Amino acid sequence: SFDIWKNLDRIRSTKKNAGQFIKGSLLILPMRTEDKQQFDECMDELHKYISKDILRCYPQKMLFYIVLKDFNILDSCFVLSVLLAFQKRLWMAPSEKSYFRVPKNINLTGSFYLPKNIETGSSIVEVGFNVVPDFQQFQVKACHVSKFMNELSNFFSQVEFGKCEANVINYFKREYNRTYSQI
RNA sequence: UUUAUCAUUGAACUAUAAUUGUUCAUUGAAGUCAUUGAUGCAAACUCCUUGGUCACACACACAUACGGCGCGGAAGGCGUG
Numbered sequence: 001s002f003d004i005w006k007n008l009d010r011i012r013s014t015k016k017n018a019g020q021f022i023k024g025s026l027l028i029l030p031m032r033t034e035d036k037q038q039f040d041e042c043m044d045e046l047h048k049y050i051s052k053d054i055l056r057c058y059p060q061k062m063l064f065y066i067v068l069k070d071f072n073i074l075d076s077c078f079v080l081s082v083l084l085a086f087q088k089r090l091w092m093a094p095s096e097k098s099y100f101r102v103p104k105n106i107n108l109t110g111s112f113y114l115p116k117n118i119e120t121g122s123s124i125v126e127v128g129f130n131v132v133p134d135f136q137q138f139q140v141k142a143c144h145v146s147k148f149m150n151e152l153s154n155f156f157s158q159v160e161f162g163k164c165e166a167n168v169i170n171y172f173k174r175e176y177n178r179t180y181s182q183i
Numbered sequence: 184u185u186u187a188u189c190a191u192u193g194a195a196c197u198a199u200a201a202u203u204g205u206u207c208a209u210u211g212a213a214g215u216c217a218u219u220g221a222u223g224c225a226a227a228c229u230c231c232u233u234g235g236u237c238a239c240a241c242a243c244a245c246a247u248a249c250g251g252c253g254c255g256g257a258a259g260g261c262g263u264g
Contacts, residue, residue: 058207117219163218165187 002102004081007149011077015153018074024161027068027076028135028172029112031087036062042086045099046079055079058169060177067169077152081145084108108143115168118161123151131179135172 001007012018033039043057054075058065068079085102087110093103102108111127113135123143130137143151165171 061208119219163186163220165218167187 002104002106002145004078004085004100004102004145004149007081007146008074008078011149011153012074015073015157018153019072021070021072021075022156022159022161023070024163025068025070026115026161026164026168027071027080027112028114028169029066029068029080029083029110030063030176031066031083031110032063033087033090034062035090038090039064039086042082042099046082050075050079058173060173065169065173065176073153073156076156077149080110080112080140080152081108081148084110084140084148085145102145106145108145108148109141111137111139113137113172114159115161115164117163118159120159122154123147124155132172132175134175 047055054069054071056067056069058067066079066083068076071079081102082099085106085108086099088106088108089096089103092106096103113132116134116136118136124138124140127137127139140148140151
């Protein structure tokens with residue numbers, strides 16, 4: 001069923017300690033929009049539940065860095081589902097204008113970055129040949145949302161992070177801007 | 184468990200406040216590597232060097248507590264010439 005509250009409760013029910021937060025946890029998702037306004041509307045509707053400390057948005061001055069810190073395993077599912085389905089529904093189904101409902105025929109596709117010093121010991125695959133110097137890129141392909149919620153749970157249940165610096169985010173911004181400036 | 188710069192300028196910002204606090208960018212200055220590090224605690228495992236792997240024994244002892252009553256070797260203490 002293509003409603004993310006229903007899947008979020010579905011995965012709160014059954015996933016063996018999905019509430020617990022992962023220590024040292026950092027996810028950076030750089031996204032692009034051609035409308036600033038509707039994207040800021042989505043971030044407001046998102047921040048009403050996500051909370052300011054766990055999820056942040058930094059605009060480069062269109063590119064917006066969406067950063068998750070200290071997220072729960074359940075929390076990452078909610079955020080990445082809303083943002084990837086928004087990024088898709090801008091092109092696919094523009095009229096519907098609901099944030100928490102993902103219309104049929106949307107397959108979630110995107111990429112996120114984790115810090116390089118994670119140890120992992122499907123639908124989310126890590127990439128060979130990653131352009132950013134100190135970060136690892138992961139790609140999610142063709143997930144319905146029910147399948148993507150499940151796959152994020154099986155992915156961040158395993159992975160385990162370690163000891164990033166305080167200003168690691170500024171470093172990611174600087175390096176990402178250098179590569180796209182070079183191209 | 185705990186750590187990862189300093190100064191200048193602009194912008195928003197909280198405020199009893201010159202704007203003390205918070206975030207973003209800019210110029211200059213240094214800057215051991217590390218963060219899979221460092222520090223605290225503890226355990227298992229694997230492996231190296233070293234030795235009289237000597238002789239006679241497989242033995243019922245002992246209150247003054249224990250024949251120090253086999254041959255060597257190592258190291259000291261003390262005595263004599």
